[PDB]
């Protein structure tokens, strides 16, 4: 590692070869405007707005992509730099729609903040805008190319960290636009509805398909009973919308807020998570002892399920037959709770609140229905929950703490670690070891693999006669690589493979509140969200294992008989089919 | 207290338009307690609705019955001084009422020791400046106080906090006109006339295209068919009856489809109108309903004080859309926009003037939608009233082709030869209408 | 008709405000008396009145500008008022207003150059049983046609 | 006291008679949108936005001005209420000018917040708006008529609080506006440039004059030396603009930020404050021992000196001849510092940072010139300082602590306590008691006059032969009342009178950042800012008295000889004259 000496505004530093002016300023209490800058994702130098004067140069230089040299002199607050910045800002703002009052972003937009900071008093440049057409036809994502500023962050996000590549650029001059392949819609092409490009946009040209009106109509119907389902990772990041410091659990306040909205019943997904863990453990035992298909892969998250149905139909045998936990809870409420409470299966509405934007399409599928009825009717994200709370306008900072309802409100830490990455396999290994040997494990050490970061491997000895091999992966590129090596035949010894679409797990989903680069550089958000989830796991003083929950024990004793029973196979199991691709 | 009970038993309800019983209003003023034990009586004579003038007529015909009810109310509620609010632009009425009060105080009726009793009552005449919004029932209070004529929210109702923070009784003049009969003859006489909900008789001032115009003392519940035909004399010149507007610009329009409807408080509000000031305007076939809707909306637009955003902004947004319909530039989809505007303005207006502003449009849209569709789609005015929509066509069998209209055309749109019928270019002229008036043979018609 | 006092004299208004100061809510009454006497309400007279009444000019200016019947500019010798009530509207007073505009050579709400003719669109005088209705100072004409407008105007 | 029992949305509770439903809902954790309602200032019911459904009512009622009665039934989230609120907001937004990117307020506008909360999707109602008239002619206050929503807050603030009444309503309908009399501008009417109407506007039609370009041009001149001076109350409220909590002092970070802009010298005004205290004590002694014109009144704040020059001229003799501390410091730097460092007085620029907008008018006065040269050239407010920090873009959250520059940077507690009300009186009493009787006074017991808030009466016995009578007043109405009491002859025995125009002292000046009614109904801002200033006062461990400062005694023993010397009368004193009012 060669050491390079440089000066920023007369302050000297030895640095590794290849540091930028912007990074040094950030670590030395100086800030420089950026629009098209993402760390490790977007280094394109296209927005042309981070210009910093360098002595002896013909013109100004962009700091985000300028490698520091030996003995250069740097000026930042000279009048020429400010004039160039304001001219560039008013030039870019000449095509944008200035209807800040009717934007969903509004308060937290990058362009609004930069315009307010730089003090652009007037817009002297007038003319015509670029063509506007809203693709409000896809299931979960909506493009609004009238607000696009062509920073190319969405393209790089979809190509690099997701390995899907369903976006590109077309045209020249004013006609240049970022569009999907062959002038089609995102519901027609090989998109997996993960929703990362939505949370990686600076101005708000990408949004979600809002379904708040359906919920509002459902609440006001006197003949319908409304039951809401709460995700485990929606209580780890909601506080952002209400000024709370990050890493704070808002379980009681969130429950109280949902009870004040007029919901008839409130339940948690953790019951379905425990049921799913039990079913997957029983399936693992059955496949191991009867020579089943190995390795066995959990199939909870819809994202990579769509990914594998679209791209890798060869290995669809390997998927588990169980449903996602929220589908388990919905089907159970629609059948057993309906029978117990003398309520017609068609006379109740169940809505789920999940940080994912692929569950909007997941619930919409026609196959995931029980007895001719939809398991889950409506699904809304965390941002839509915050918008609903703000529209109802209840003070969220002064709410007391309230408890969940019985019996689907009973929770275990095995289903609280479930939201973060590595929690599903953690709970599965704990439960299977306890069942098979009474072997008490609490944490698993995961090996960091050289060359590829984010893919995890472990090997815990369950029985002296059986050691199990484990693989955990999150992120599109990691799933691509692990599926490629599985097809190549290098994973014959593997037993468990867990795959998550969104990098970092469901704590970094597509429906979580959006943070800018400023708040992103200070703290890695996924790590401390997972830390908050683990701390909540350490604060659960009742039961730390899934099979010790009295609710699931009573359920299996009264209705479900034994795991993997014919009734359980009929109710909680579904099949998967390949989907054609049009890219 | 016995006076209050008699008035309540008489079933007398205020004919101002809101239909609130005067007995309850007097009771709520009587039971209130003031700091210094001072109570007031204030009265409304500020008629503002066009086509209705009974409020000035009762003053200029018999002001003694007006001022006796003043002392009756003052004794009933314990008020020692009273006020009157009459427009200053009616010099004859003001002079007659001031001569009447001068005579009453000369005889000793008004002042101290009224008829050798312990009740003393005094009257001061307030000269209004004639503003429609000042005719409102808190704006009058503010005007008497000397401030701007902007209305106040209620509650506190004026029965509990009136002049200078003291309880005060407010009623219109023609309501007071009937109390001598109640006192002298009994409540059963009033209860014997009219229906169960509303008792007595009412004054109707009628106008428009009618053979005979004037005021009528009609029993409560008389049908409109009897008023228009038996008493009104029918539609003049044999024209086709379309509708009668009731309640003024704050009321509605009743077509011939409900001509047999009983006229009362409940039936009118079920039909989309109300009593209003008591004015009726009957109109015949030569009328275009879009134009009269625009006029009835413009009247309220020009009289809005501007305090609350609905009555200040939405009235002009409604005026603009009707203007563009009248000018022929309108497009489809305006009907639901009018509906949304009316429902929004109806439920969120501080003042009562902005609540009834979209009422004529609501009455007309439910009954005469085909005229709106003809104006929007066919670009044709059936009545030949919309200036920019009608076409001037000459009758070749009658036109002499003299060319007088050609010389009088300001846009140079009429061309032709002598002794031969001319031609009219619609796209050239601005449809001023001078050519049809300049024609001596009357060969030009509007289509 | 009494002669209108020139606005330069500030003693008559002082006498009026001194005589009528004790009456509650006397602002409107004093404004009507000054409008009747001086002919109109200029800003200097308004400031003077606010000076003796001990009230900021905000209230006086607001209450004088609130009522359309308080004039801020001088008027002509004769005032023309066309009844724009419902009864006069249905009979066709719009053509009457158009004829008045054509003959008078001035728009609605404008003062003629000679200071002799003034037009105003009064909503209702109260004689709405004789539509159409016209008012010239203290004279009221009812049941008018288009052709009679120049004939009636020639009388003045 | 009658006790009214009532239920709101299913919660019963006791109020005194006259309690509005909005207060009960807010204090019982229910929030309702609001635009035109301020505490004890504006209760008119004009905005028509807080509509709440009441059972048995004809239509929706306004909550903010609704007195509650026994046994009512209230619902706040019926679909009718939401639809009415949305329609009303879309109606109000149809006349507003909607260039939020070029609006000075922007990030903290109430209208933008309400538009974002309620979800205004589309604006269906177009048309023609009321005319635009920007009054860019005054020195301190500027009006933009295209942004007004006719909420009428400024009228009540200027009429009821300041008791000046130079604003009214003209016209009816779309021709109705808020305007001064005569159809003139503010520079032609008897305004006092206090600035309360600016901080009490909810949308930002009222702003202050911008002098940032003059400062930027002054800095860019290589031949000009620039000296910035800081006010004592700016550092008790500046941190609020950078996310710091309520009542935090940022002295070191302020010094570092000011040094980073490029100012040649940075100084604090407390030096001139101590000089002014010494001079005022000297005139006290001179007038007491010679039977001068009493009671004495201050000459510090330009607002009420303009109030005197406009409304009450016969009291000009009662005024003190000493200049304001800003003018004292400016003239002293223009003469003594220039002589010491051999710098041309005409080649220097002095800029001050104060929480006032009237100081912009104080600078414009011609009579405050020394040797034909103006004392202070450019004056800016706190908001402009924060905007300059944001445009120069230094991360104010991570500056290291620094100190002021010598010798004019030394400060004492008696000069720090000026910001809150009662500080000048305390400092003057302290210094005069120490000089005359060696009496160590620390606090002053204030007696509040019954029925009136803002006037404080006390009596301190400095010597057995001299008991000093004291009067303190803040707010326009209190100044008017004490002036009436003085002119009526009821203030014959008083010795000191202090008057401030803005209510609560300069900590609540018109140059401070704007806080909406949300945080304004939570915490008393004047009390907490005064608490911060007093806490900083209590931690000055070097010197707590004015005459004990080494810098002032060095100055007096080297340059100014003795207090009220001929040189002092020539340099630090000025005269006042009456001014014409056109209201
Ligand atoms: O008394 C009082 C009452 C209240 O009322 P209501 O019922 O609620 O209602 P209203 O407000 O009334 O409604 C409205 C109506 O009206 C009518 N109209 C129309 C047009 C014109 C007229 C007239 N003429 O008149 C006056 N004006 C006006 C105007 C306007 C715009 C308005 C809005 C109003 C008015 N007004 C009214 C008044 O204020 C009253 O109402 C009366 O006065 C009463 O009396 P009588 O006798 O009638 O009954 C008026 N007025 C007069 O007089 N004048 C004039 O001019 C009208 C139509 O139809 C519409 O719709 O009641 C009572 N209360 C209530 N609540 C209560 C009470 N009390 C006690 N307690 C309680 N809680 C009061 O006091
Ligand atoms: O997958 C992903 Fe998730 O984190 C999201 O959110 S929360 Fe879950 O426990 C499962 O099911 C739920 O329940 S795993 C999801 O659907
Ligand atoms: O106001 C203002 Fe001020 O803050 C400044 O700016 S500093 Fe003061 O104490 C006085 O009083 C002094 O010192 S109040 C001013 O002149
Ligand atoms: S995209 Fe951003 S800058 Fe543009 S209107 Fe929306 S919020 Fe404002
Ligand atoms: S949702 Fe995911 S896969 Fe679809 S376009 Fe966006 S980033 Fe690509
Ligand atoms: S959609 Fe958003 S992220 Fe993609 S290029 Fe446009 S502005 Fe950038
Ligand atoms: S990882 Fe979680 S948030 Fe991401 S797509 Fe899968 S279920 Fe949705
Ligand atoms: S409805 Fe509102 S704007 Fe209209 S007159 Fe009444 S208070 Fe004024
Ligand atoms: S209406 Fe007027 S412009 Fe048109 S043809 Fe007739 S005279 Fe000419
Ligand atoms: S004035 Fe009449 S008759 Fe003469 S040419 Fe014209 S239309 Fe024909
Ligand atoms: S006043 Fe408010 S809503 Fe209007 S442009 Fe400015 S910030 Fe936007
Ligand atoms: S200027 Fe501001 S405070 Fe005054 S009425 Fe307009 S919006 Fe309200
Ligand atoms: S600066 Fe003060 S005196 Fe001047 S208009 Fe505003 S509030 Fe009134
Ligand atoms: S903040 Fe202080 S100096 Fe400024 S106007 Fe108010 S009282 Fe005067
Ligand atoms: S941030 Fe450097 S060019 Fe975009
Ligand atoms: S109808 Fe009112 S003036 Fe003629
Ligand atoms: S906020 Fe309630 S009426 Fe203004
Ligand atoms: Zn027509």
| Element at C134 (helix H, strand E) | strand C133-136
Q: Check: CB of residue A240 under 8 Å from CB of residue A389.
A: no
Three-state secondary structure along chain B?
CHHHHHHHHCCCECCCCCCCEHHHHHHHHHCCCCCCCCCEEEEECCCCCCCCCHHHHHHHHCHHHHHHHHHHHHHHHCCCEEEEEEECCCHHHHHHHHHHHHHHHHHCCCECCHHHCCCCEEEEEEEECCCCHHHCCCHHHHHHHCCCCCCCCCCCCCCCCCHHHCCEEEEEHHHHCCHHHHHHHCHHHHHCCECCCCECEEEEEEEECCCCCEEEEEECCCEHHHHHHHHCCCCHHHCCEEEEEECHHHCEEEEHHHCCCECCHHHHHHCCCCCCCCEEEEEECCCCHHHHHHHHHHHHHCCCCCCCHHHHHHHHHHHHHHHHHHCCCCCCCHHHHHHHHHHHHHHCCCCHHHHCCCHHHHHHHHHCHHHHHHHHHHCCCCCCCCCCCCCEEECCCCCCCCCHHHHHCCCCCEECCCCCCCEECCCCCCCCCHHHHHCCCCCEEEC
Q: Is D463 left (phi over 0), alpha (psi -120 to 50) or beta?
A: beta
Structure token digits, residue A478? 């990691």
C146's CB contacts (< 8 A; 6+ apart) are C95, C96, C99
Determine contact, residues A232/A269, Cβ cutoff 8 Å.
Answer: yes
Within a domain: B219: yes
Q: Give the domain range for residue B207.
A: 201-284
Nearest Cα to D357, choosing from D476, D228, D578, D207?
D207
How close C114 comes to chain B (CA, Å)?
A: 27
Using most ligand atoms within 8 A of CB, pick from D99, D105, D108, D114 the residue to mutate for ligand 11: D105
C residues 69-108 lying closer than 8 A (beta carbon) to D:
none
Q: Hey, is the C-beta of A247 within 8 angstroms of any chain D C-beta?
A: no
Distance, in Å, from the CA atom of B437 to the CA atom of A119, rounded to the nearest integer, reads 62
Instruction: Assess whether C52 and C91 both reside in one domain.
Output: no
Sign of CA dihedral B178, B179, B182, B183: negative
Distance CA D509, CA D195 (A): 7
Judge contact between D423 and D280, C-beta under 8 A.
no
Q: Are D96 and D111 in contact (CB under 8 A)?
A: yes
Q: Among D210, D193, D206, D187, which residue's Cα sits nearest to residue D147?
A: D206
Ligand 9 centroid–CA B416 distance in Å is 14
Q: Which atom belonging to ligand 12 lies closest to the Cα atom of D143?
A: 1
Same domain, C104 and C146: yes
Could you tell me whether strands D177-179 and A466-474 are parallel, antiparallel, or unpaired per DSSP bridges?
unpaired
**Out of D53, D208, D309, D362, which one is annotated catalytic?**
D362
Q: Distance between CA D173 and CA B315 in Å, rounded?
A: 10
Distance CA B61, CA B45 (A): 14
CATH of the domain at B435: 3.30.70.20
Residue among D79, D116, D209, D256 with most chain A CBs within 10 A, to mutate: D116
Domain extent at residue D190 = 134-212
| Dist CA A470 CA A446 (whole Å) | 9
Q: Residue C30's domain spans which residues?
A: 10-66
CB-based pocket (< 6 A), ligand 6: A 148-154, 178, 201-203, 205-206
Distances (CA, A) of D111 to D51, D93, D107, D385, D512: 17, 8, 10, 25, 21
Looking from the CA of residue A147, the nearest atom of ligand 4 is: 1
d(CA A409, CA A414): 14
Mutate to test the pocket of ligand 5, among A142, A144, A160, A162 (most ligand atoms within 8 A of CB): A162
Q: What would the 3-class secondary structure string for D454-492 be?
A: CEEEEEEEEECCEEEEEEEEECHHHHHHHHHHHHCCCCC
Residue C72 lies in a domain: no
Does residue D320 have an active-site annotation? yes
CATH number where B234 lies: 3.10.20.600
CATH number, domain with residue B74? 3.40.50.11540
Final residue in a domain of this structure, among C66, C90, C107: C66
Domain boundary among C66, C93, C114: C66
Asked whether residue C87 falls in the same domain as residue C143, the answer is: yes
Would you say D97 and D48 are in contact if contact means Cβ atoms under 8 Å apart? Answer: no
Residue D498 catalytic?
A: no
Residue B384 lies in a domain: no
Cβ neighbours of residue B310 closer than 8 Å, sequence gap 6 or more? B344, B345, B348, B349, B354, D48, D88, D91
A508 upstream amide cis, omega within 30 of 0: no
User: Atom 4 in ligand 13: which residue has the minimum CA distance?
Assistant: D191
Asked if residue B383 is part of any domain, the answer here is no
Which of B50, B141, B299 to mutate: most C Cβ within 10 Å? B50
B365 in Cβ contact with B255 (< 8 Å): no
Task: Provide the CATH number for the domain around residue C100.
Answer: 3.40.30.10
Residues B400 and B321 in one domain: no
Determine whether the shortest distance from the Cβ of D500 to ligand 14 is under 6 A. yes
Helix or strand holding residue D254 (H, E): helix D251-261
Q: How many domains does chain B have?
A: 4
Contacts of D173 in chain B (CB under 8 A): 301-302, 304-306, 312, 316
D106 annotated as ligand-binding: yes
Instruction: Tokens 């003042």: give the residue.
Output: B351
User: How far is the first Cα of chain C from the last one, in angstroms, to the nearest whole number?
Assistant: 17
Query: Is residue D583 within 8 Å of D166, Cβ to Cβ?
Result: yes
- What A110-116 contacts at long range (C-beta under 8 Å, 24+ apart), as own/partner pairs, is A110/A35, A110/A202, A110/A203, A110/A516, A111/A35, A111/A149, A111/A202, A111/A203, A111/D101, A112/D100, A112/D101, A112/D106, A112/D107, A113/D107, A114/A33, A114/A35, A114/A49, A114/A89, A115/A89, A115/D101, A115/D102, A116/D101, A116/D106, A116/D107
Choose one of B391, B395, B397, B399 to mutate for the ligand 10 pocket test, by most ligand atoms within 8 angstroms of C-beta.
B399
Does the CB of D67 have a partner CB in chain B at under 8 Å? yes
Atom index in ligand 15 nearest the CA of residue A47 equals 4
Which residue positions of B form the known binding site for NAD(+)? Answer: 16-17, 20, 25, 154
DSSP state, A182? G
Distance of CA A262 from the midpoint of ligand 2 (Å): 25
- Spatial CA neighbour of A401 closest among A250, A283, A552, A526: A250
Q: Which atom, in ligand 11's list, is nearest to the CA of D93?
A: 3
B299 CB within 8 Å of a chain C CB? yes
Q: Are A459 and A469 in contact (CB under 8 A)?
A: yes
Residues of chain D contacting C59 with CB distance shorter than 8 Å: 168
* B109 inside domain: yes
CB A502 within 8 A of CB A474: yes
C51 and C104 in a single domain? The answer is: no
B145 touches chain C (CB under 8 A): yes
Same-domain check for residues B81 and B183: yes
Shortest Cα distance from C67 to chain B (angstroms)? 7
If you measure from the C-alpha of residue A455 to the centroid of ligand 7, how many angstroms do you get, rounded to a whole number? 16
Looking at chain B, which subunits does it touch, using at least 3 CB pairs closer than 8 Å as the criterion?
C, D
Task: Report residue C126 as tokens.
Answer: 């109260």
Bridge partners (DSSP) listed for residue D13: D6
A152 burial via Cβ count (<10 Å: 0-12, 13-18, 19+):
middle
Active site residues of A: 280, 283, 300, 320, 359, 362, 367, 506
Nearest to D124 among B307, B337, B350 (CB): B337
Is residue A22 within 8 Å of A37, Cβ to Cβ? yes
Same domain, C83 and C15: no
Among partner residues C43, C47, C58, which is closest to D165 by beta-carbon distance? Answer: C58
Ligand 16 center–CA D556 separation, angstroms? 85
My answer on whether C60 and C82 are in the same domain is no
Residue ending a domain, among B267, B284, B301, is: B284
B297 and B182 fall within a common domain:
no
- D75: exposed, middle or buried (Cβ count in 10 Å: 0-12, 13-18, 19+): middle
Taking CB atoms and an 8 Å cutoff, what residues of chain D touch A262?
77
Last residue within a domain, chosen from C66, C89, C108? C66
Chains D and C, touching by 3 or more CB pairs within 8 angstroms? yes
- Looking at the structure, tell me whether residues B50 and B183 fall in a common domain: yes
CATH number reported for the structural domain that contains residue B366 in this entry? 1.20.1440.230
What's the domain count of chain C?
2
Q: Counting ligands in written order, which one lies closest to the CA of residue A106?
A: 4
C83 and C59 in a common domain: no
Q: Which ligand is nearest to the CA of D65?
A: 17
Rounded to the nearest 10 degrees, what angle do helices D270-290 and D423-437 cross at? 60
Query: Is C1 a domain residue?
Result: no
Q: At what angle do helices D110-118 and D79-92 cross, to 10 degrees?
A: 140
Separation of A103 CA from ligand 4 center, angstroms?
Answer: 6
Domain's final residue, options B250, B284, B318: B284
Of D496, D490, D447, D446, which Cα lies nearest the Cα of D467? D496
Our answer to whether residue D276 is catalytic in this structure is no
Q: In this structure, are C43 and C110 located in the same domain?
A: no
Q: How far apart are CA A87 and CA B305, in angstroms?
A: 45
Is the CB of residue B112 less than 8 Å from the CB of residue B73? no
| Residue D194 Cα: closest atom of ligand 14 | 5
On whether the CB atoms of residues A76 and A88 are closer than 8 A, the answer is: no
State the sign of the Cα–Cα–Cα–Cα dihedral B170, B172, B173, B177: negative
B241-246 and B279-284 beta bridge pairing: antiparallel
Strands B168-172 and B40-44, sheet pairing: parallel
A76, A30 contact by CB (below 8 A) = yes
Kindly tell me the burial class for residue B410, based on how many C-beta atoms sit within 10 Å of its own C-beta (0-12, 13-18, 19 or more). exposed
The Cα–Cα gap between A229 and A255 comes to 11
**Residue A158 DSSP code:** I
Whether residue B326 sits in one domain with residue B213:
no
**What span, in angstroms and rounded, lies between the C-alpha atoms of B16 and B48?**
12
Q: Is C148 within a domain?
A: yes
| Of D268, D281, D266, D269, the residue nearest D327 (C-alpha) | D269
Question: From B54, which residue of chain C is nearest by alpha-carbon distance?
Answer: C126
Give me the CATH number covering residue C25: 1.10.10.1590
Q: Are A190 and A216 in contact (CB under 8 A)?
A: no
Report the alpha-carbon distance of residue A502 to residue B325 in Å, rounded.
Answer: 55
- 């944001």: which residue's tokens? D390
C65 vs D: CB within 8 A:
yes
**Dist. CA C44 → ligand 17 center (Å):** 37
Which pair of tokens denotes residue A178? 């970022």
Which residue has 């029983």 as its token pair?
Answer: A282
Q: Note whether residue B254 is domain-resident.
A: yes
| Residue in D254, D237, D423, D265 with CA at minimum distance from that of residue D330 | D265
D365 is in an annotated binding site: no
| CB of D296 closer than 8 Å to CB of D497 | yes
Distance CA B354, CA B139 (A): 14
CATH number at residue A170: 3.30.70.20
DSSP H helical segments within A321-422, as ranges? 325-332, 338-341, 359-364, 382-392, 413-416
d(CA D78, CA D67): 21
Q: Helix or strand or coil: residue A34?
A: coil
Say if residue B414 is in the same domain as residue B297: no
3-class DSSP state for residue D389?
helix
């Amino acid at each position: 590692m060669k050491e390079i000496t440089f000066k920023i505004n007369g302050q000297e530093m030895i640095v590794p070869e290849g540091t930028t002016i912007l990074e040094a300023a950030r670590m030395n209490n100086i800030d420089i405007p950026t629009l098209c800058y993402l760390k490790d994702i977007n280094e394109i130098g296209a927005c042309r707005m981070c210009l910093v004067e360098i002595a002896g140069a013909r013109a100004l230089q962009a700091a985000c992509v300028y490698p520091v040299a030996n003995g250069i002199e740097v000026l930042t607050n000279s009048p020429k730099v400010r004039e160039a910045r304001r001219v560039n800002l008013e030039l870019i703002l000449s095509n944008h729609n200035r209807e800040c009052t009717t934007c969903i972003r509004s308060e937290n937009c990058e362009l609004q903040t930069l315009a307010t900071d730089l003090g652009v008093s007037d817009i002297p440049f007038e003319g015509e805008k670029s063509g506007k057409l809203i693709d409000d036809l896809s299931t979960s994502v909506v493009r609004d190319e009238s607000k696009c500023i062509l920073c190319k962050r969405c393209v790089s996000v979809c190509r690099d960290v997701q390995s899907v590549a369903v976006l590109g650029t077309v045209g020249r001059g004013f006609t240049s636009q970022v569009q999907p392949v062959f002038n089609k819609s995102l519901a027609d092409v090989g998109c997996i509805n993960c929703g990362q490009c939505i949370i990686n946009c600076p101005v708000g040209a990408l949004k979600e398909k809002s379904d708040i009106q359906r919920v509002w109509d459902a609440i006001a119907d006197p003949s319908k009973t409304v039951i809401v389902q709460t995700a485990p990772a929606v209580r780890a990041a909601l506080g952002e919308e209400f000024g709370y410091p990050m890493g704070t659990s808002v379980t009681g306040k969130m429950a109280a807020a949902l009870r004040r909205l007029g919901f008839d019943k409130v339940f948690d997904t953790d019951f379905g998570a425990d049921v799913c863990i039990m079913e997957e453990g029983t399936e693992l035992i059955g496949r191991v002892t009867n020579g089943g298909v190995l390795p066995m892969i959990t199939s909870c998250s819809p994202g990579w399920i769509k990914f594998i149905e679209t791209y890798y139909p060869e290995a669809i045998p390997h998927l588990s037959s169980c449903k996602s936990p929220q589908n388990i809870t919905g089907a159970l409420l629609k059948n057993h709770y309906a029978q117990t409470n003398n309520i017609d299966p068609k006379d109740m509405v169940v809505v789920s609140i999940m940080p994912c934007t692929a569950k909007k399409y997941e619930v919409q599928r026609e196959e995931l229905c029980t007895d001719g009825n939809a398991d889950v009717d409506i699904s809304i994200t965390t941002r839509e929950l915050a918008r609903m709370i703000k529209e109802a306008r209840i003070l969220f900072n002064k709410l007391p703490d309230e408890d969940f309802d019985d019996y689907y409100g009973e929770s275990t830490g095995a289903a609280v670690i479930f939201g973060a990455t590595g929690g599903v396999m953690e709970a599965a290994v704990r439960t299977v070891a306890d069942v098979l040997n009474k072997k008490d494990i609490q944490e698993i050490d995961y090996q960091i693999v050289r060359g590829v970061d984010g893919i995890k491997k472990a090997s815990v000895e369950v029985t002296p006669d059986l050691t199990v091999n484990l693989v955990v992966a999150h992120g599109g590129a990691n799933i691509r690589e692990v599926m490629e090596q599985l097809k190549a035949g290098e994973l014959a010894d593997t037993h468990f493979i867990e795959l998550m679409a969104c990098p970092g797990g469901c704590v970094n989903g597509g429906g979580q509140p959006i943070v800018s680069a400023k708040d992103k550089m200070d703290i890695d958000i996924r790590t401390e969200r997972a830390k908050a989830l683990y701390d909540e796991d350490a604060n659960v003083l009742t039961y730390r294992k899934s099979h010790q929950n009295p609710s699931v024990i009573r359920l299996y004793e009264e209705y479900l008989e034994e795991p993997n029973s014919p009734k359980a196979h009929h109710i909680l199991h579904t099949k998967y089919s390949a989907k054609p691709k049009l890219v | 207290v016995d006076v209050i009970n008699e008035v309540k038993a008489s079933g007398l309800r205020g004919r101002g338009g809101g239909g609130f019983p005067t007995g309850l209003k007097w009771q709520f003023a009587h039971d209130a307690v003031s700091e210094d034990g001072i109570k007031y009586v204030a009265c409304n004579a500020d008629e503002g609705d066009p086509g209705a003038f009974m409020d000035r007529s009762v003053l200029e015909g018999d002001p003694h019955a007006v001022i006796e009810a003043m002392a009756i109310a003052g004794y009933a509620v314990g008020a020692s001084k009273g006020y009157v609010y009459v427009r200053a632009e009616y010099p004859i009425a003001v002079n007659r009422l001031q001569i009447a009060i001068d005579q009453a105080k000369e005889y000793g009726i008004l002042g101290e020791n009224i008829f050798e009793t312990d009740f003393s009552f005094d009257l001061e005449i307030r000269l209004g400046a004639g503003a429609f919004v000042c005719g409102e029932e808190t704006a009058l209070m503010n005007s008497i106080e000397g401030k701007r004529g902007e209305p106040r929210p209620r509650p506190p109702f004026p029965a509990n906090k009136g002049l200078f923070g003291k309880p005060t009784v407010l009623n219109n003049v023609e309501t007071y006109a009937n109390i001598p009969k109640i006192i002298l003859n009994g409540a059963e006489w009033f209860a014997s006339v009219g229906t169960e909900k509303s008792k007595g008789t009412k004054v109707f001032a009628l106008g428009g295209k009618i053979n005979n115009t004037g005021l009528l003392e009609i029993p409560m519940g008389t049908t409109l068919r009897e008023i228009i035909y038996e008493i009104g004399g029918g539609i003049p010149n044999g024209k086709a009856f379309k509708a009668a507007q009731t309640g003024g610009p704050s009321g509605g329009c009743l077509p011939e489809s409900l001509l047999d409807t009983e006229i009362d408080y409940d039936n009118l509000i079920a039909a989309g109108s109300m009593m209003g000031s008591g004015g009726l305007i009957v109109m015949d076939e030569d009328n275009c309903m879009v134009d009269v809707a625009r006029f009835f909306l413009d009247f309220t637009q020009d009289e809005s004080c501007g305090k609350c955003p609905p009555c200040r902004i939405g009235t002009k947004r409604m005026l603009e859309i009707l203007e563009r319909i009248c000018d022929g530039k309108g497009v489809e989809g305006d009907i639901e926009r009018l509906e949304e505007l009316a429902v929004g303005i109806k439920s969120s207006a501080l003042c009562g003037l902005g609540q009834t502003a979209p009422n004529p449009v609501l009455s007309t849209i439910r009954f005469f939608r085909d005229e709106y569709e003809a104006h929007i789609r066919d670009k044709k005015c059936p009545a030949g009233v919309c200036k920019h929509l009608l076409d001037f066509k000459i009758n070749a069998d009658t036109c002499k082709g003299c060319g007088i209209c050609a010389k009088k055309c300001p846009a140079d749109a009429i061309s032709g030869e002598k002794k031969k019928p001319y031609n009219i270019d619609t796209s050239k002229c601005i449809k001023c209408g001078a050519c049809i008036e300049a024609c001596p043979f009357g060969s030009i018609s509007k289509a | 008709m009494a002669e209108l006092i020139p606005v330069e004299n500030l003693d008559v208004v002082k006498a009026i405000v001194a005589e009528h100061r004790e009456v509650p809510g006397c602002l409107m009454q004093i404004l009507q008396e000054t409008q009747l006497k001086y002919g109109y309400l200029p800003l200097e007279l308004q400031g003077t009145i606010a000076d003796e009444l001990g009230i900021p000019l905000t209230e006086v200016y607001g209450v004088a500008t609130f009522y359309s019947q308080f004039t801020l500019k001088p008027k002509g010798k004769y005032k023309i008022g066309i009844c724009l009530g419902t009864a006069c509207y249905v009979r066709g007073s719009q053509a009457i207003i158009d004829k008045v505009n054509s003959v008078l050579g001035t728009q609605v709400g404008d003062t003629t150059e000679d200071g002799k003719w003034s037009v105003d669109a009064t909503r209702c005088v109260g004689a709405c049983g004789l539509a159409p209705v016209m008012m010239i100072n203290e004279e009221v004409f009812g049941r008018l046609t288009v052709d009679e407008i120049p004939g009636i105007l020639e009388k003045y």
